[PDB]
Ligand binder design. Structure first.
Ligand SMILES: *[C@@](O)([C@H](CC(C)C)NC(=O)[C@H](CO)NC(=O)CCCCC(C)C)[C@@](C)(O)CO
Ligand SMILES: [Cl-]
Ligand SMILES: [Cl-]
Ligand SMILES: [Cl-]
Ligand SMILES: [Cl-]
Ligand SMILES: [Cl-]
Ligand SMILES: [Cl-]
Ligand SMILES: [Cl-]
Ligand SMILES: [Cl-]
Ligand SMILES: [Cl-]
Ligand SMILES: [Cl-]
Ligand SMILES: [Cl-]
Ligand SMILES: [Cl-]
Ligand SMILES: [Cl-]
Ligand SMILES: [Cl-]
Ligand SMILES: [Cl-]
Ligand SMILES: [Mg+2]
Ligand SMILES: [Mg+2]
Ligand SMILES: [Mg+2]
Lengths: 237, 233, 230, 234, 220, 196, 248, 204
């Protein structure tokens, strides 16, 4: 078995493999999350378009369990490993606790998996960040983010992947009690956030919603372009 | 490139020295030991107003009589904290008594140099932990504050700062500390010092504070209790 | 312990150079020839045999794997002995399960799979040999080559080792589908004579044949007979 | 250079730089002194405090009723080695119902610490010990090194500026065998005091003392308990 | 089962009956009990049928690997060692009782091999539930240095003694004759038992059996 | 002691199970449920040794749910039955055998209703109706007598009730109440408990 | 030993995995291999590299492999590496069938193998497999399907796609000629030959130089067939007749 | 006895250029019938079937694990398995469990995929093979089955006579066994077709 130390410190306290894993995430498609009042929304960029692609097979938004889902940015193969590990863990939790996981529980699990792959022989870090959303037993909506280091935090709204800096800036100015007063506006807030950075808007925003108790609904291109027009004609006024 | 267990010509392990430099990239934390209890105070370091401040947890309960403040690479601290928790519960299970603060700190510190790539299990630790820790609590010795760093060296301190501004903060701590200082004075002093060293304007959401006292279990200050103490400061 | 990392890796241009370099060890080896006739197969090889001091009979390059399968090679002799040993073991493992001699193509696939391992597994180099494998099963002759990558190919006739490019064109202008085994033996020896240098005797070439009756080495006296015409 | 990163690489001069570097960890620790008479073995240690508000690092550790140690170098290596020593002592009492002879324990340390100096990817122990003990052959002071060598000593000092302490100990060692306990500890303290900058003195905050002998189990004296020994350095 | 062997002037004669049983019922009337080891070595098997088959097959296979390597004809001692060391390792749990015979560079050799791993090198041996009947024939009639035909007569007499006096043994007599020059695998050698003939015909015409359902599936 | 029954009609499967958990001479629970939802259209009914029953059923349940999460669609009843069987059979000769008897009921969009019977040895049989427990000895002949493959769901509940009344009359154990559920195109429906 | 370890499973400074990128350069040089999905079936067509006069012809194809009753694949890249992966695909497919007693759905087989490829990029210090694969299949969940996987352990589903030599050019020609929802096996066959005719531009196209396999459904059963040379020459004839119409 | 816990009977029989294989249809647990359509005969090729009697769980496991092995064999080799080779594969599978066996004793019936020559065999539970030129039987009424086969079988029977003989041998044998029967299924295998029939049979 291969036991080389891969992630090591360098002078000044850097972990270069982890910094390089974060560079991988920054070249991934943009992903955005907003925590509503009684909805949570995830939207993600692109990636390629390509008419001959079967769309179903490349989604970047994934159910972990009935009450938790995630989006990611970065290395898609790495993400598939993390997602399947988290799906197994959600079933262990149900098995031994007889409740669904809290969003914080499964986040904490994913983050500590990532942290372990920065401190174990023979392995490189995972080149992904994740946005994790859903609802707790008591109806409280949640949005968490994890990164390759294993650090995690809760957010009101957030973006990861390429153009996350400017999308985050947009959200900081646009996330208010008014912008999330209803479900339709929460959804629009995510689309506006994407439509800033999204190349040939749009077209190639994939979007999904989760309502309290109601399980993951992904929107279709017809339901998306309804919202797109409904915001674009409003921005003329 | 050299191995992770290589000594430098000065007799230090490169990896450990480099891990110590990572502590300086952390937020500042402060610990003070008084005869009336210990307090732990930490700068949260909020990077966006969209981030939930209560999701930053740099002070944690180890057991009812022991808290822990951390600085450095926070993700690294999780396995150390969990080891501390498990050890105090094992000690309770076995001996039906609370574990001393010193003993908890010692147990955690024995993990420190357990890294390397050709003694150990298929995927054991590849590097040291980029974390420093302050353990504050009360046992039959009375109130106690211990510091630990990535070398596995641990020591009792009357007052100690760790992280980015610890020089600075340590100097102000020498100035204000005295053995007969009250807990309420210690709490005020540590917020005054955090206020100086923090880049952001101190307020009741971008710091955390906790105490442990002979009367009373580990206690995290609420927003409302922080606001009260912040008025004077 | 063992090194657990690969010693063969991809270069920027997409080449596995250790495998290429293993092929250069093959190219510099002594010549080998295989010809599939209508009713059998011949394998022939030159001995890199200096001295009269060698006991030519003491080690063989043409070797039986089973009653019905045989092998020769070009490249590094000691690497070859490894593959001969594993091929024999693979053939017996098959026989124990199925109670039928291993089909030639099945044996080649399993041997080629071992060669592939040594291009990826930890702390080892690839084999510096290419194998020519002959057999008879389902009433029909088979000739295969297996290279240091673990790639294998079925041939009507081919050449490997020193001067192989020329040997292949010599066979291209000389093999026909309807050729008999006795004629094929003759053209195999002529193919070696193209690049020989030394004067051929029965002591510095080795010939093996495969037909319905099975695989066997020709004896020194039989090779002498074929050499009288040449 | 190409010869200094691996404990498995001999230099062309017949040296192992990684072992020499590990020995620098001990030379930079705070000084400790060990000495003996006919009846007692004593350890004396200077404790370094990080800031004015820190306790001062433990330097003297209990191993068994008849054995204690003083450390210099990497503290985590000191604990690992001290735990090995403790376990070897417990094993001997369990099996044989008698104390492990001090010279046998030191042999076990030599053998244990040599192993990683010969295997790739391992490192020497970065700690030096002074070992005080008492058994059927009387009192002992031993010294152990990162090279896995060890020494049987009339007295010894290791750590920073320990050359001065060693010079004092050579100067007075003809007196040690006949000293009463108080005289012997005083000699330990005067040796340790030679390691200090001219400004600074021995205090109850910076001195730690360990003693074992015929009538006395290994005992550690710290803080207010060292005062009896420091008064009357007259 | 009755199995036996003899050393004669120029070789080995092995013999066996052809009955296999399950309890006190005949499962096979024509089981082959004389197994190939190498071209110059054969082995009769008694005891648990799967164990005799698998044990002889394995050793034969390992011996072929051996001879391929050496380039020489194998030795009977080598088969003996390989068998006994494996059987010893399994502590009698492999229920193979064997009569091993062959001819090698040192001449003819015959061994009996038992399930626990003991072996006896002898000029005549018997095994199986018929072994005492067969041994009585040998004790009464064996002579050293018999000619081929005498030895063949003696072995088939011995197998016949087991066939007719042991309920575990029956049907045909197989022999294997091994010399320096020749291998004669004589299956059957003798057929002393024959099913009696059927006196009435039970040729049931189509429609005798009533059928509930039928499906024809055509193939290529 | 535990009773399970299933009756498959043209487009539904009806199942029932007693609600007793017993220990020595006492009923310790009278509202026990022996049914495990595997998916929207699959129930596993499990009886046998204490510990084994819940441990086995919940393991199967979690893995069936995992399959859904990984793939976006559910296992069919037949696939789930064969999965269940593979696990039981694989454990049979291990250090951890599970001493459980089961029924698996389901409805597949394309294959319609299915009822599967499995014993602790892991023999798997598809059946139009089936039962487990000592109570099966008194009720299987009632099913043989009155079952027809086109039986409507009303009549299946009547037939079920004949079986359960026979246990009240003739069986030595006190099994006074039963859980009843049905599965069809629209999933799993709770019916009223049948009680005495 | 740290000096000799080339460190195949680490990141470069830009978050790249060099061995994966280099393996992808190997694939780009291998035989062109395309897949095309139709309403009534799916096909694979591949350039043969085994084309010397003296080769013998013993198997039913060179680069098309049957995986189970309902699926086949083709490969571009290192052949010995392809033999390892296709053996593993067959095992995975039989493990599923053993467990569930139904065929493995196509995407599940692809994903299972992609997880093995992914592992080789993340731990173990080995070189990755130098193979890309096209998978064709039918299952009861999504019917006729075409997938592509590469050495990163990434995959996607496609209506039409190409790997190996001149991939980019092949995909452009597919983009322009492929009719989403309207292709038949007969028109997918025509398009495959059109594409190979342009991308084997060293040089003139011949039945000896290509291999075509079709996957269809007949009487509730999946039929996977490798076209005989007679049929391939007929399709080449029709394409050449068709280009004679191209102007007037 | 473990082998009689479920009961059951299979047999196979050779005719001219055809073979027949037959089985009872009961699945029961000691005295109790559970089902009357339990499968015991499994296709291993177009013209090659295996019948298993014994413990029902092992009937299913052996059929399934054998099919795993056969599918891999056929994908890897060019071709359909020969009857004799299937026998060997099965022997190897059973003998791997020599010290904790599967409780099943199979029969194989088929035609060689190239030559169409008839083949029948049976194996014991640890994989000892027996090939015959007439018939083989396995199950809880083996003595009954032997008595019918020995009395009725003749050489070189055409498909119709083969069908009548195997059917009469099965029906009359299982009618003397409490734990076998509840129906009989018969497959006749010829070069150009398979004929599958269920027989009018006693249901007690
Ligand atoms: C024989 O020892 C005979 C030798 C054997 C190699 C055929 N042994 C048997 O028949 C044994 C005796 O228990 N039976 C079996 O191993 C059961 C398998 C028989 C069924 C066929 C599939 C082979 C004698 C003397 O025991 C024969 O009675
Ligand atoms: Cl892990
Ligand atoms: Cl980001
Ligand atoms: Cl610090
Ligand atoms: Cl290594
Ligand atoms: Cl060999
Ligand atoms: Cl062979
Ligand atoms: Cl030979
Ligand atoms: Cl020190
Ligand atoms: Cl240290
Ligand atoms: Cl030294
Ligand atoms: Cl020193
Ligand atoms: Cl011997
Ligand atoms: Cl299949
Ligand atoms: Cl399949
Ligand atoms: Cl298996
Ligand atoms: Mg149990
Ligand atoms: Mg009956
Ligand atoms: Mg009856």
């Amino acid at each position: 078995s291969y036991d080389r130390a891969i992630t090591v410190f360098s002078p000044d306290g850097h972990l270069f493999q982890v910094e390089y894993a974060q560079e991988a995430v920054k070249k991934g498609s943009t992903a955005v999350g907003v925590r509503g009042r009684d909805i949570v929304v995830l939207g993600v960029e692109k990636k390629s378009v390509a008419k001959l692609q079967d769309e179903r097979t490349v989604r970047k938004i994934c159910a972990l369990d009935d009450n938790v889902c995630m989006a990611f940015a970065g290395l898609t193969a790495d993400a598939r490993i993390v997602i399947n590990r988290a799906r197994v863990e959600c079933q262990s939790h149900r098995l031994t606790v007889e409740d669904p996981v809290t969003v914080e529980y499964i986040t904490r699990y994913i983050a500590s998996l990532k942290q372990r792959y920065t401190q174990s022989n023979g392995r490189r870090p995972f080149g992904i960040s994740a946005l994790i959303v859903g609802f707790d037993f008591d109806g409280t909506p949640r949005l968490y983010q994890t990164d390759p280091s294993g650090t995690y935090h809760a957010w009101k709204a957030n973006a990861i992947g390429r153009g996350a800096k400017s999308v985050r800036e947009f959200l900081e100015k646009n996330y208010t009690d008014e912008a999330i007063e209803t479900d339709d506006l929460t959804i629009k807030l995510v689309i506006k956030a994407l439509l800033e950075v999204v190349q040939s808007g749009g077209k190639n925003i994939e979007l999904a919603v989760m309502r309290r108790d109601q399980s993951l609904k992904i929107l279709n291109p017809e339901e998306i372009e309804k919202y797109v027009a409904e915001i674009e004609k409003e921005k003329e006024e | 490139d050299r191995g992770v267990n290589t000594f430098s010509p000065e007799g230090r392990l490169f990896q450990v020295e480099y891990a110590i430099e990572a502590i300086k990239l952390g937020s500042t934390a402060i610990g003070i030991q008084t005869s009336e209890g210990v307090c732990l105070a930490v700068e949260k370091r909020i990077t966006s107003p969209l981030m939930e401040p209560s999701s930053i947890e740099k002070i944690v309960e180890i057991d009812a009589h022991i808290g822990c403040a951390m600085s450095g690479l926070i993700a690294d601290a999780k396995t150390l904290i969990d080891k501390a928790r498990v050890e105090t519960q094992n000690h309770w299970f076995t001996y039906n008594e609370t574990m001393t603060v010193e003993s908890v700190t010692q147990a955690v510190s024995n993990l420190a140099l357990q890294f390397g790539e050709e003694d150990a299990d298929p995927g054991a630790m590849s590097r040291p932990f980029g974390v420093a820790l302050l353990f504050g609590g009360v046992d039959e010795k009375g109130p106690q504050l211990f510091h630990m760093d990535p070398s596995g060296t641990f020591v009792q301190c009357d007052a100690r700062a760790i992280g980015s501004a610890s020089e600075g903060a340590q100097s102000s701590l020498q100035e204000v500390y005295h053995k007969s200082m009250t807990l309420k004075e210690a709490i005020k002093s540590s917020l005054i010092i955090l206020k100086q060293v923090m880049e952001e304007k101190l307020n009741a959401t971008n710091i955390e504070l906790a105490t442990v006292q002979p009367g009373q279990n580990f206690h995290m200050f609420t927003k409302e209790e922080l606001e009260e103490v912040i008025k004077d400061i | 312990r063992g090194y657990s990392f690969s010693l063969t890796t991809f270069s920027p241009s997409g080449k596995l150079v250790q495998i290429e370099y293993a092929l250069a060890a093959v190219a510099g080896g002594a010549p080998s020839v295989g010809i599939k006739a209508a009713n059998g197969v011949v394998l022939a090889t030159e001995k890199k045999q200096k001295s009269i001091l060698y006991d030519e009979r003491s080690v063989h390059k043409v070797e039986p794997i089973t009653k019905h399968i045989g092998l020769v090679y070009s490249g590094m002799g000691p690497d070859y002995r490894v593959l001969v040993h594993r091929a024999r073991k693979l053939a017996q493992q098959y026989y124990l399960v199925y109670q039928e001699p291993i089909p030639t193509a099945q044996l080649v696939q399993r041997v080629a799979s071992v060669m592939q391992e040594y291009t990826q597994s930890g702390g080892v180099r690839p084999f510096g040999v290419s194998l020519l494998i002959c057999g008879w099963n389902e009433g029909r002759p088979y000739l295969f080559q297996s290279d240091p990558s673990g790639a294998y190919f079925a041939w009507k006739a081919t050449a490997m080792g020193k001067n192989y490019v020329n040997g292949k064109t010599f066979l291209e202008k000389r093999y026909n589908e309807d050729l008999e085994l006795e004629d094929a033996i003759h053209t195999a020896i002529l193919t070696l004579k193209e690049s020989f240098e030394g004067q051929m005797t029965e002591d510095n070439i080795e010939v093996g044949i495969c037909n319905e009756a099975g695989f066997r080495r020709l004896t020194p006296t039989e090779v002498k007979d074929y050499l009288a015409a040449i | 250079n190409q010869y200094d990163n691996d404990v498995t690489v001999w230099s062309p001069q017949g040296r192992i730089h990684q072992i020499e570097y590990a020995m620098e960890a001990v030379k930079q620790g705070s000084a400790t002194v060990g000495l003996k008479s006919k009846t007692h073995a004593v350890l004396v240690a200077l404790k370094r405090a990080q800031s004015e508000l820190a306790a001062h690092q433990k330097k003297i550790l209990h191993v068994d009723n008849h054995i204690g140690i003083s450390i210099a170098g990497l503290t985590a290596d000191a604990r690992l080695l001290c735990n090995f020593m403790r376990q070897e002592c417990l094993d001997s009492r369990f099996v044989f119902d008698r104390p492990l002879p001090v010279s046998r324990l030191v042999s076990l340390i030599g053998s244990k610490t040599q192993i990683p100096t010969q295997r790739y990817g391992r490192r020497p122990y970065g700690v030096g010990l002074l070992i005080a003990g008492y058994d059927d052959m009387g009192p002992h002071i031993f010294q152990t090194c990162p090279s896995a060598n060890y020494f049987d000593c009339r007295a010894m000092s290791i750590g920073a500026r320990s050359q001065s302490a060693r010079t004092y100990l050579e100067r007075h060692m003809s007196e040690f065998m006949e000293c009463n306990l108080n005289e012997l500890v005083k000699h330990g303290l005067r040796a340790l005091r030679e390691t200090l900058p001219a400004e600074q003195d021995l205090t109850t905050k910076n001195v730690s003392i360990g003693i074992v002998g015929k009538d006395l189990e290994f005992t550690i004296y710290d803080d207010d308990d060292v005062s009896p020994f420091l008064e009357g350095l007259e | 089962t009755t199995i036996a062997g003899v050393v004669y002037k120029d070789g080995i004669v092995l013999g066996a009956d052809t009955r296999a049983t399950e309890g006190m019922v005949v499962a096979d009337k024509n089981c082959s009990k004389i197994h190939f080891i190498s071209p110059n070595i054969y082995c009769c098997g008694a005891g648990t049928a799967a164990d005799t088959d698998m044990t002889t097959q394995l050793i034969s296979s390992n011996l072929e690997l051996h001879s391929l390597s050496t380039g020489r004809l194998p030795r009977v001692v080598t088969a003996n060692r390989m068998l006994k060391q494996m059987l010893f390792r399994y502590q009698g749990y492999i229920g193979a009782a064997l009569v091993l015979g062959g001819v090698d560079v040192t001449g003819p050799h015959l061994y009996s091999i038992y399930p626990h791993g003991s072996t006896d090198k002898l000029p005549y041996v018997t095994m199986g539930s018929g072994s005492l009947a067969a041994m009585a024939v040998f004790e009464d009639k064996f002579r050293p240095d018999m000619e081929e035909e005498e030895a063949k007569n003696l072995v088939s007499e011995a197998i016949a003694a087991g066939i007719f006096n042991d309920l575990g043994s029956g049907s045909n007599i197989d022999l294997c004759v091994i010399s320096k020059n020749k291998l004669d695998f004589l299956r059957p050698y003798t057929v002393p038992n024959k099913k009696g003939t059927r006196l009435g015909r039970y040729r049931c015409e189509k429609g005798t059996t009533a059928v509930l359902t039928e499906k024809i599936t055509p193939l290529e | 002691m535990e009773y399970l029954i299933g009756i498959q009609g043209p487009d539904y499967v009806l199942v029932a199970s007693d609600r007793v958990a017993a220990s020595n001479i006492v009923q310790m629970k009278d509202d026990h449920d022996k049914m495990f939802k595997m998916s929207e259209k699959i129930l596993l009914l499990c009886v046998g040794e204490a510990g084994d029953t819940v441990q086995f059923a919940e393991y199967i349940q979690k893995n069936v749910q995992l399959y859904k999460m990984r793939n976006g669609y559910e296992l069919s009843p037949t696939a789930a039955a064969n999965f269940t069987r593979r696990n039981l059979a694989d454990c049979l000769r291990s250090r951890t055998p599970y001493h459980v008897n089961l029924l698996l009921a389901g409805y597949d969009e394309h294959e319609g209703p299915a009822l599967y019977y499995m014993d602790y040895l892991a023999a798997l049989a598809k059946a139009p109706f089936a039962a487990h427990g000592y109570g099966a000895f008194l009720t299987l002949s009632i099913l043989d007598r009155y079952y027809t493959p086109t039986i409507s769901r009303e009549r299946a509940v009547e037939l079920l009730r004949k079986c359960l009344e026979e246990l009240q009359k003739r069986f030595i154990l006190n099994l006074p109440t039963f859980s009843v559920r049905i599965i069809d195109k629209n999933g799993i429906h709770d019916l009223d408990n049948i009680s005495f | 030993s740290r000096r000799y370890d080339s460190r195949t499973t680490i990141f470069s400074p830009e978050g790249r995995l060099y061995q994966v990128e280099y393996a992808m350069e190997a694939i780009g040089h291998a035989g062109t291999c395309l897949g095309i999905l139709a309403n009534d079936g799916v096909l694979l067509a591949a350039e043969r590299r085994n084309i010397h006069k003296l080769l013998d012809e013993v198997f039913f194809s060179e680069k098309i492999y049957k995986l189970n009753e309902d699926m086949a694949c083709s490969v571009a890249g290192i052949t010995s590496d392809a033999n390892v992966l296709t053996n593993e695909l067959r095992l995975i497919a039989q493990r599923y069938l053993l467990q569930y007693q139904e065929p493995i759905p196509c995407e599940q087989l692809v994903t299972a193998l992609c997880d093995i490829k992914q592992a080789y990029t993340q731990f173990g210090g080995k070189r990755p497999f130098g193979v890309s694969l096209l998978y064709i299949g039918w299952d009861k969940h999504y019917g006729f399907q075409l997938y592509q996987s590469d050495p990163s352990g990434n995959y996607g589903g496609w209506k039409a796609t190409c790997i190996g030599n001149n991939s980019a050019a092949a995909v452009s020609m597919l983009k322009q000629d492929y009719k989403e929802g309207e292709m038949t096996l007969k028109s997918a066959l025509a398009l495959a030959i059109k594409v190979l005719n342009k991308t084997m531009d060293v040089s003139k196209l011949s039945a000896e130089k290509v291999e075509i396999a079709t996957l269809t459904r007949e009487n509730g059963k999946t039929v996977i067939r490798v076209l005989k040379q007679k049929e391939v020459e007929q399709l080449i004839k029709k394409h050449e007749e068709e280009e004679a119409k191209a102007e007037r | 006895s473990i082998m009689s816990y479920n009961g059951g009977a299979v047999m196979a029989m050779k005719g001219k250029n055809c073979v027949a294989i037959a089985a009872d249809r009961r699945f029961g647990i000691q005295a109790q019938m559970v089902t009357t359509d339990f499968q015991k005969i499994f296709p291993m090729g177009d013209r090659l079937y295996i019948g298993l009697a014994g413990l029902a769980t092992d009937v299913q496991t052996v059929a399934q694990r054998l099919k795993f092995r056969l599918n891999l064999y056929e994908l890897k080799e060019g071709r359909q398995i020969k009857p004799y080779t299937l026998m060997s594969m099965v022997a190897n599978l059973l003998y791997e469990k020599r010290f904790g066996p599967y409780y099943t004793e199979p029969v194989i019936a088929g035609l060689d995929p190239k030559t169409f020559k008839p083949f029948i065999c049976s194996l014991d539970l640890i994989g000892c093979p027996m090939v015959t030129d007439d018939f083989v039987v396995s199950g809880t009424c083996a003595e009954q089955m032997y008595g019918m086969c020995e009395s009725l079988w003749e050489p070189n029977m055409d498909p119709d006579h083969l069908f009548e003989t195997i059917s009469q041998a099965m029906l009359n044998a299982v009618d003397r066994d409490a734990v076998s029967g509840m129906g009989v299924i018969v497959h006749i295998i010829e070069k150009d077709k398979i004929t599958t029939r269920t027989l009018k049979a006693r249901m007690d």
